[PDB]
Design a protein around this ligand. Structure first.
Ligand SMILES: O=P(O)(O)O[C@H]1[C@H](OP(=O)(O)O)[C@@H](OP(=O)(O)O)[C@H](OP(=O)(O)O)[C@@H](OP(=O)(O)O)[C@H]1OP(=O)(O)O
Ligand SMILES: Nc1ncnc2c1ncn2[C@@H]1O[C@H](COP(=O)(O)OP(=O)(O)OP(=O)(O)O)[C@@H](O)[C@H]1O
Ligand SMILES: [Mg+2]
Ligand SMILES: [Mg+2]
Length: 246
């Protein structure tokens, strides 16, 4: 909500509305395990740009859908809760209900919006709010992720291994227990006009406004992040299995 949410320019220049996202990117900046692994957007740096009477800090990162012709986008919110120690009390009844009535508390992952461009664009939009009704079980989440891989003509089964490979790299780094992340997402994207060789597909962790750096501060509550990644990987592996019957 801090910028118009739509992706054929090179960058995203995201405003720093608090310290957390910028501190996270700065903290992982020299760690090849975060920056050489391709699991978060390429981070260009924190920059000041004129704003108001002075300057506002922004994060400059890559636009993951740069030059995508027919973008497919799926945002999956990770964790067994989406509130954190700083969440405003006026938001908490809703946060608790949405967490318990989606797949968040059970799986540590939930559907959080999709866009499919099947030739008749403007594209088909799938509301993030579907998580508490249409996409409120493991089975239905699996179905909606399959729909992500449906380009309007066929299931892009050949892309699924990439996505699992990305989740593995995420799992490997998130076993280290150095950060807790709340309301962060794994963003799946591809251009349906892509071939495997074009590499116009991507799977990245995003949205670090509620990240806690455990070597610098206390965060007692659990995020269930690794649990969610493992469940999501399990769903993708089931999908690989299911796509062989095609
Ligand atoms: O009031 P909250 O419970 O935090 O609800 C918000 C919020 O919507 P409203 O401002 O309309 O209530 C968001 O926008 P901001 O206020 O943070 O700008 C939005 O974030 P996005 O605009 O980035 O989508 C978001 O949705 P989400 O974080 O799920 O994408 C959503 O939370 P809910 O989706 O749970 O209503
Ligand atoms: N690097 C990126 N490349 C392409 N799309 C992105 C990128 N980062 C985010 N997006 C898209 O923009 C949406 C919003 O991004 P994000 O949630 O990071 O920011 P925000 O909603 O403005 O602020 P907050 O961090 O407070 O939620 C995402 O759901 C995703 O669809
Ligand atoms: Mg937001
Ligand atoms: Mg957010």
């Amino acid at each position: 909500g801090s910028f118009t949410q739509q992706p054929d320019g090179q960058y995203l220049l995201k405003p720093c509305l608090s310290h957390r996202e910028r501190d996270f990117y700065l903290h992982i900046k020299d760690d090849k395990e975060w920056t050489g692994t391709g699991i978060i957007p390429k981070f260009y740096g924190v920059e000041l740009h004129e704003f108001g009477f002075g300057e506002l800090e922004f994060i400059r990162m890559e636009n993951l859908m740069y030059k995508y012709k027919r973008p497919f986008v799926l945002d999956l919110k990770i964790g067994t809760q989406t509130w954190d120690p700083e969440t405003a009390s006026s938001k908490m009844k809703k946060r608790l209900v949405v967490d318990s009535t989606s797949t968040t508390t059970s799986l540590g992952v939930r559907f959080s919006g999709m866009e499919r461009n099947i030739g008749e664009e403007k594209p088909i939009l799938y509301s993030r709010y579907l998580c508490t009704h249409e996409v409120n079980t493991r089975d239905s989440l699996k179905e909606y992720i399959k729909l992500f891989f449906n380009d309007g003509k066929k299931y892009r089964k050949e892309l699924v291994p990439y996505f699992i490979s990305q989740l593995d790299k995420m799992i490997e780094v998130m076993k280290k227990r150095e950060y807790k992340m709340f309301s962060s997402s794994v963003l799946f994207v591809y251009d349906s006009t892509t071939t495997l060789e074009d590499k116009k597909y991507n799977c990245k962790m995003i949205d670090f406004a509620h990240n806690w750096i455990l070597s610098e501060e206390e965060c007692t509550v659990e995020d269930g992040f690794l649990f969610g990644l493992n469940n999501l990987k399990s769903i993708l592996e089931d999908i690989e299995n299911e796509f062989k019957s095609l």
